[PDB]
Every structure is written in C-alpha cells, then in structure tokens.
C-alpha cells in the first residue's frame, strides 16, 4: 500500500520536465531526481536508461534506488512523454484529484491540454525559434486566455489540475525569453510581446499565472537562476551551431 | 435519460468520427448520430451547432432530443476532439473497461495513442496529401507494427482499448486509399505501399487489422460503401479546386 519508488530524469531549461515536477508536488509524492545533460545522453543515459530516444522527462516507477550511470531494474516501469506521465500520476494518486472527478470537467482539462500542445507550442516555436511576427504570438495568447474560464479559477474550473501543470512551465519560460530578450526574435518582436503580456489585454491570463505561482508547488519546482542559466546556455549553443 | 443522452455529429470519410463510434459500440452505449457532409458541408452546422471550428466528431451530452438544423441546448455539454471523446467515454462507462485498470497499462495505451497522433497521422498526410515518397510511409507503418505485442492481441495488451479505436480507422482508410489509388500520391507511390501492406513484412499488422475487424463493433461502425462514396467524393472535389 505504500507508494512505490519514483525517480524522474529531468533538466531545467525545457518546460516538459517541469510539468511532471508540478504534478509530483501536487500529489505530495516521494521522488528523487536525476539531471540529464548532453554529455549524460552521449555517455550513459542513451545506453543504459533510454535507448530509443534518450529524452527527458522519463519517469521510473518501482525498483530499487537509482543513481546516475546505472540501468533501471528490468522490473520497473519506464514512462516517457510529459503529458502521459501527467495522466499516469493522476491515476497513481487518485486521492490527490490531479484531475477532477466529473467526466465533463475531465474532458475540459484534456481539451485545454490538447490546445496547449497543438496550438500554443507551435506558435511559441514560430516566434522564438523562427523569428515570426509578434502579432501571431499574441493571437495565440489571446486564444489561450479565452480558453481559461472567464468566471475565474484554474484551467478546468475552480480546482487545480494537470491541465495547469501542462501550460504553466511554458508561460513562465515565454515570459523569461521575452524579458531577457533571449531568442531568435524578429527585430523588436520581443518587447512587443513583453509589453502586451503586462497590459490590460492579458488581465485574465495574468491573474491565472499569479494564482498558479502562489501555490507551494511552484516554489518547490521553479528555480529561476537554474532555469535562466540553462535556458540561456541552450540558446547560446543553438546560436553557435549555426 | 435527459441527463445522459448522447448525440454524435459525425461523417463517414474521416477517421476521426469512426474512432468515437468504435468506443460507443464497445461500451454498448445508447446514442444518436447526425451526419454532416464532408463534400458539401451544411451551413447550419457552423451557424447553429459548432461555430468555432465546424468539425466532426462533436459529441453532445445531456439535454433533449436533437435533430439536424437545430442548435444544441445551452445546458448540454459539447465535446470536440476525437481523442478527448474517447477518454470521456472511458470515464463515462467504467464497466466496459475501455482502458485497463492498472496505471502502467493505461500509460501503455496512452503512449500508443500519442504515437498514432504525432507520428502515424503526420506520415499519412505527407504521403496522401503532399505526394511524399512511399518509403517514409512504410517507415511509419514499420514503427507502428513494432509497437504491437508480437505474439498477438491488441495495442495495449490482450484486451481491446481506446488505443485500438484511435488507430483502426486510419489503417482501414489508408488501405482503401492505396488500393483504389484515391489520393494525391506521387507516381508509383500507392502501389508500393499497397503491395507492402499485403506482404509478409506486415503480417503482424495484418493480423491486428483482422482481429479488430472480427469484433462486432467493426460491423456496427464501418460501412465501407458509404465511407468510400464520401471519401472519393471529397477527394474529387478537393482535386477540382486544385
Ligand atoms: N483533432 C480533431 C480533428 C477533427 C477533424 O479534422 N475533422 C475534419 C475531418 S475532414 C472536419 O470535420 N472538417 C470540416 C471541414 O473540412 O470542412 C479530431 O480528432 O477530432
């Protein structure tokens, strides 16, 4: 009946491991983390841990204590894909209500997550990686904001859910990128987005971000210095290979 | 009941409504269907039913009886997005076991579905809509086949699940398209894939298709003459608009 072992392979720059950390903290799970860098991928993580894709996040469920440069027990479950890991944690910790009980509100959470993955993330890539115009990024943020309940609350309604885990790491890193002006932005594009995100246009979205940041799971999982250092480091690597 | 009435806006040519129909039948659900043409779409669909996107499937849950050319009640729930609808039906009908009970096995089903949506469907689009080469389509089919349990059974294990509902409509339409050569295929590309699908390389996938077709839910959801008529009609219309 006691929880089986959880080990999470992660990193800081990407939004995807942060999603999982938020859900683990909201579940009050016991877990250990292992940071994966490119050297780890090349030297042992692809070989001993995750041969098919060597990506993070990657959750190991069951088995004995796990350290870097070690293969997981063949008897443990290995789960990739941040969104699937979120649904897994909601199934594993039912008393935490990481998804709501009502089936329509569960559908609402999943519709919100679908839109994050299929609409917001492509828009962020077009803006940050491909130097697209700020108006298209702000239109995607308008659409995201309109999917939040206008009467208040979290993405699926009054209660926090894995839908909030899915989007909050992206919003925090988007704000960081446009505030530090770190990215492959069209000229002047970052300030346009930064200023709009602080304006009355985005009052609802600002309230939503604040509501999520005020929860204990955010302080437990957001280390601004570490995220910045790896985010900027990744950008400088991208810039240099080019 | 008025609390639990299901009305499904659907069509025949697209795989997406079929996915939903498979799960409804596996759950032995009671439901009504409204047919939206994918050749000459009824203007009342966008105007009265689904103004934002006017896509099928669209599931209406609760409220009074609903007929064509009528707006759903404001008090009924409206659920788009086939993969979300499948998860919704698994939540509504727990006794049908549309997903397995164990969290790890539920993750297995969800990983299979994610690969359908993010790997197989993009490959089909590149091949059928954009005239891409047949080896890229075969690579995606090889990868799908390798995700199946080798000894037999369904996508997530011995029992049927919504992972099977996600993929089987695509496989049936792919086979039909390459067999009739109805699509925007490169010269020579359709026969390469048609022959491969019938060859020993794809024996495991053939057995999979046959095991799904043998279930009663297939005859209750797959009218190949109606699918083909709308599929060909839509293709010929699209081609004529260049
Ligand atoms: N992600 C959606 C995709 C739905 C979709 O693409 N529907 C198309 C099938 S052609 C549609 O309804 N199109 C309306 C139109 O083309 O006018 C799902 O899985 O339900």
Residue numbers in the entry:
A (entry chain B), B (entry chain A): 2 to 243
Source paper text:
To further explore this issue, we have conducted biochemical and crystallographic studies on the interactions of six GSTOs from T. versicolor with chemical libraries. The six TvGSTOs (named TvGSTO1S to TvGSTO6S) used in this study are representatives of the twelve TvGSTOs that have a catalytic serine, while four others have a cysteine instead. In this study, we demonstrated at the biochemical and structural level that T. versicolor GSTs that belong to the Omega class interact with polyphenolic compounds found in wood, and in particular with flavonoids such as dihydrowogonin and naringenin. The ability of TvGSTOs to bind polyphenols through different sites suggests that fungal GSTs could be involved in the transport of various polyphenols.
The crystal structure of TvGSTO6S was solved at 1.45 Å resolution. As expected, it reveals the same overall fold than TvGSTO3S (rmsd 0.78 Å, 183 aligned Cα per monomer). While G-sites are made of similar polar residues, differences are observed at the H-site and at the interface between monomers. The lack of a structure with a ligand that binds in TvGSTO6S H-site precluded its fine description. However, when compared with the equivalent region of TvGSTO3S, significant differences are readily apparent in TvGSTO6S. Most of the residues that line the benzophenone binding site of TvGSTO3S are different. In addition, the extension of the C-terminal α-helix by two extra turns leads to an open and shallow H-site, contrary to the buried H-site in TvGSTO3S covered and closed by the loop corresponding to the extra turns. There are also slight differences between the dimer-interfaces of both isoforms. The larger residues of TvGSTO6S (L112 and T115 instead of T110 and A113 in TvGSTO3S) and the loss of the inter-monomer interaction between Y118 (replaced by E120 in TvGSTO6S) and E80 present in TvGSTO3S probably account for a more open dimer in TvGSTO6S. Its interface residues form a pocket centered on the two-fold axis of the dimer (rectangular section of 8 × 6 Å2), larger than the equivalent region found in TvGSTO3S (rectangular section of 7 × 4 Å2).
